[PDB]
């Protein structure tokens, strides 16, 4: 009975930020990337790093960039509506689960809230049907330590997982993440971390040699 978070046009993006995209070469991104209203010069991605289109609001950015202000603007706007929709959900199923550290848990469908920072220091499973939905509401940061893998079980799909964070996200080196990130600030990945998901930041996305794939 938990409704999907509608991403509108932002659904078309693996990475969408408002202040840019930094990168330690070489990353492997599958899906479109965009930044707005910042200049496309703030996208530090090469053409060989993106399987998809790089969208700029202006004439600056990587050589393969497409200038389309109105699409980037709509996407960022839809990302804000999604962020507010996700943050606005009421009547959580869980509050302060694991007291802000959830290593080793198996997370079943529902609306989860943390009034603090959330840490993921060891492997977790997300377990549910192909139609089940998870919304994780985090009033601080979200941290996941090096080499931590999020596993999906029971038919659970990346496209039906949403992480809403009031603070910054940090995914440790070589970690594997599952789901959509709606961050009010930054999403910062470290050396060889991967995500099956979307990085939607109201500030910047920062990468270090990452694999980023849009959910199927």
Numbering used by the authors: 61 to 276
From the reporting publication:
The FfIBP from Flavobacterium frigoris PS1 exhibits high TH activity and relatively strong recrystallization inhibition activity. The FfIBP structure is composed of parallel β-strands in a helical pattern, which is mainly stabilized by inner hydrophobic interactions and intramolecular hydrogen bonds with long α415. Additionally, the FfIBP has a capping head region that consists of two small turns and β-strands, which contain a disulfide bond. This disulfide bond increases the overall rigidity of the protein and reduces residual movement at the ice-binding site, thereby augmenting TH activity and protein stability.
Based on the CD and MD simulation data, four mutants annotated as FfIBP_CC1 (A101C-A120C), FfIBP_CC2 (S96C-L132C), FfIBP_CC3 (M249C-N270C), and FfIBP_CC4 (G160C-S176C), possibly forming disulfide bonds, were generated. The FfIBP_CC2 is located at the interface between the body domain and the long α-helix (α4). To confirm the disulfide formation, we solved the crystal structures of the FfIBP_CC1, CC2, CC3, and CC4 at 2.0, 2.1, 2.0, and 2.0 Å, respectively. Successful formation of the disulfide bond at the intended location in FfIBP_CC1 and FfIBP_CC4 was confirmed by X-ray crystallography, whereas the rest did not form a disulfide bond. The failure to form a disulfide bond may be due to dihedral angle constraints and the inappropriate distance between the two cysteines. When the RMSD values of alpha carbon mutants were compared with the wildtype, relatively high RMSD values exceeding 0.4 Å were observed around the mutation sites of FfIBP_CC2, FfIBP_CC3, and FfIBP_CC4. In contrast, FfIBP_CC2 exhibited a drastic decrease in the melting temperature by approximately 8.3 °C. The mutation at the Ser96 and Lue132 to cysteines likely distorted the conformation of the residual interactions between the β helical body region and α4, which was vulnerable during thermal melting.
